[PDB]
Design a protein around this ligand. Sequence first.
Ligand SMILES: Nc1ncnc2c1ncn2[C@@H]1O[C@H](COP(=O)(O)OP(=O)(O)O)[C@@H](O)[C@H]1O
Ligand SMILES: Nc1ncnc2c1ncn2[C@@H]1O[C@H](COP(=O)(O)OP(=O)(O)O)[C@@H](O)[C@H]1O
Ligand SMILES: Nc1ncnc2c1ncn2[C@@H]1O[C@H](COP(=O)(O)OP(=O)(O)O)[C@@H](O)[C@H]1O
Lengths: 131, 745
Amino acid sequence: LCSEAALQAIRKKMDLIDLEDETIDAEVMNSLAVTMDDFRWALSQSNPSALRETVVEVPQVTWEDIGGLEDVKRELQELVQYPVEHPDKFLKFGMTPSKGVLFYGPPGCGKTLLAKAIANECQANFISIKG
Amino acid sequence: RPNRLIVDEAINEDNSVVSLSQPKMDELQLFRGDTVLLKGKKRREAVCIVLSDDTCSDEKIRMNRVVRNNLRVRLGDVISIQPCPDVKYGKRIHVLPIDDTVEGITGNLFEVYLKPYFLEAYRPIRKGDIFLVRGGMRAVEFKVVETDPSPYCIVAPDTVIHCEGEPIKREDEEESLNEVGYDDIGGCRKQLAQIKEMVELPLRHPALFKAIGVKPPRGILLYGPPGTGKTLIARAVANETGAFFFLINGPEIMSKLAGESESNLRKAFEEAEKNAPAIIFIDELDAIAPKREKTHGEVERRIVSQLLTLMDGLKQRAHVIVMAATNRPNSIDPALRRFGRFDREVDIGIPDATGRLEILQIHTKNMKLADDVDLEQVANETHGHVGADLAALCSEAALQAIRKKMDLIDLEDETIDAEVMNSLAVTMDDFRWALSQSNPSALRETVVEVPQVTWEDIGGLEDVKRELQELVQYPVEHPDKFLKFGMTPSKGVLFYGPPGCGKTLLAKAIANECQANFISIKGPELLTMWFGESEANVREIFDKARQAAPCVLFFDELDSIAKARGGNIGDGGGAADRVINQILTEMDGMSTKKNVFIIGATNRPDIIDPAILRPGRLDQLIYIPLPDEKSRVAILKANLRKSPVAKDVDLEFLAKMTNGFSGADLTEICQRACKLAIRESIESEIRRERERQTNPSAMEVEEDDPVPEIRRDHFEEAMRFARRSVSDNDIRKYEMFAQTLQQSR
Ligand SMILES: Nc1ncnc2c1ncn2[C@@H]1O[C@H](COP(=O)(O)OP(=O)(O)O)[C@@H](O)[C@H]1O
Ligand SMILES: Nc1ncnc2c1ncn2[C@@H]1O[C@H](COP(=O)(O)OP(=O)(O)O)[C@@H](O)[C@H]1O
Ligand SMILES: Nc1ncnc2c1ncn2[C@@H]1O[C@H](COP(=O)(O)OP(=O)(O)O)[C@@H](O)[C@H]1O
């Protein structure tokens, strides 16, 4: 992408200069600088190769994005953050914390946003599998 | 120096015209038609006549193939012009044909070729010039050997043309004015432009890439149906840029014995390496590098690995560009697609109606088709043909037209006469006869092309038209106002209403208005990949839609899966849900960079799965109501375009009396009336022909055939045999669902 973006900016300053004459002394290109328009054009005719692949990343949704649900906020914090940050303290009591939770409610109430935010605070990955 | 310009191809096919720009002509104090002297490389000069142009820039000069060959230059070079308006009228000109063009012609060439060419044109010529003339069935090149006064002269009605003597030997400076080039390709403007750009960059000035330090492409993959002209594209590019085109044939390599195949391939690459900037063409790539599972032997693996190693062995040196041709771009070994190997893919699709017309125009340039044929009709009735088929059609038409003249050339001689060629013409009957016994090869292929339906074809439906214009045209025609300010455009629209009201017409109309490609997937095929076949087909359907962006993907009868699902089978519901899973999975995978629009049509809105009805998918609902108002009159005009008349059967009364009817019913009425008119005309013709058998030519007053003159009685009789297809229950069901949609959510 970067290479062809440079090539296009060379193109837009090739015909008007005397390319027919003795070769350019690499100073016109020194005067040449790329622009965001060239990058957009290069992005236009690009062929990505990843596409159908599971993506692993840290979602960027913060708890300010969601409103209310202070109860589920606290419950999810208790479920997830305590074992990872306080393993020795559970080991003192010697209990295995539960690993699992279920969300059920009316459609479109922020379950996906809740999962994204709770993964955001723990600074963890997020593998999503859909129906 | 405001003299030098840049050479580019011209649009006018005359041999003595060069197109400048009006400002440049004005600066050089030259007027229309003034003779000019053009001087190019190798110290060759020629004389020509300038004209005006529409959109040519100041630094570009347009000229055809003959003038470029005479000046001994190529595309993208520069020339120095000079106005020299002191041409003196010539007296005697000696012109001779070339050896390898007149094999078996004899006759007197002056009365056939030269006289029509040199009349009322005043073509300037210069000593040593070479020009090409189209004749009976061949293109003959003539070389001027001497003139008087030397070296400039103008052919005038009073000249002494000498055209006698032996043909002269072809020299070794001009390659030829007969091989392939950019003027021998039609219907592939966009792809040819892409390839031309991408290959003109490295093959002209390698030193610029050396100094800049960027990576030129090292492989180009062309794929398409066989016989669409890929080898021809590569040959044209190689012969125009200037290279050492070196073809490699797949079957030829596979036909060797064991260990010599890879050795031959290695000599091929090393030879192309040490013969200057060259293009290597590999034909039938899938024949030598198929998928790994297809291969069963061991020599195939060795050949594939050898090809891969030699491909990876290219690092800079001479800029050698590798091109390969394959039928369908999935049988190739997936290993041959990583970066540094074949990576850039260009699609060569089947030509549309304009492409077929252009191919026919190209192939019949030598012939002398009579002034009665209509190439537009032959072009637009031959859908499903490729370039090779059209070339074969033209050849067969010529052969048929020349067959019925054997009496004139009975025996004759081994060298056919000349005037007999000019006595030959090809008529529409010959073309139709060649059409009849011809079988195309595309047939079962998805068709992508811009539909021709316009806005006036549809009567009424103003609100739907406005809504489609807002939803489709705005996000694309002014993408700046959408990238500024964060609006997320919708990805789909779902149509629902009574059957036969014109959903397909609206989709085609908006596709035409947006000037975007149209792909239609109909119910029968959709159920074909439902049961029996698999769901892998949707993958390449979406891939092809992505390739030709922008596009308007159309899914017709989306409820067919549910209609077949509900019954007494209960076995294939899994197949229907796989269809929906595929549709959803590649529907959500689309990105906003590309403009792909998905439109679905259905007539049972309450049976569709609610998964599709969701943000991020097909979410807007548009209800097309049952027709009313004198927009059905516009409907009647739409299919009465070609139908001649209606006299005095007021269509407005019909619109008033025919309320509650869809478009299909009205079109049926029009077709029935036309059928009655045809029946009446044929029975009248038969009556006349059986009447003429008694009285021989007893007709004092001359009547031609009855002109199509549809009366009121035909239409009334047709109207008597008419009913309404859509009952009153379906419209009430639709309005009930509309009210439920309005209130429940
Ligand atoms: N705090 C929130 N609570 C509920 N819905 C929200 C909130 N913030 C945003 N939304 C909106 O709700 C919509 C549906 O949320 P989502 O979690 O995907 O639904 P579901 O949990 O049913 O899959 C999203 O498009 C989002 O824009
Ligand atoms: N504009 C055109 N587009 C496609 N085919 C053309 C065109 N002009 C001529 N042809 C014919 O198509 C043939 C191209 O060869 P083709 O069989 O397509 O090569 P390949 O076997 O590599 O596909 C030529 O014989 C030529 O006569
Ligand atoms: N404005 C219009 N309203 C209704 N029908 C029309 C209109 N314009 C044309 N038609 C007719 O309607 C027919 C379109 O039918 P079509 O949409 O293919 O059926 P379906 O609605 O089942 O897909 C065409 O034959 C056309 O002649």
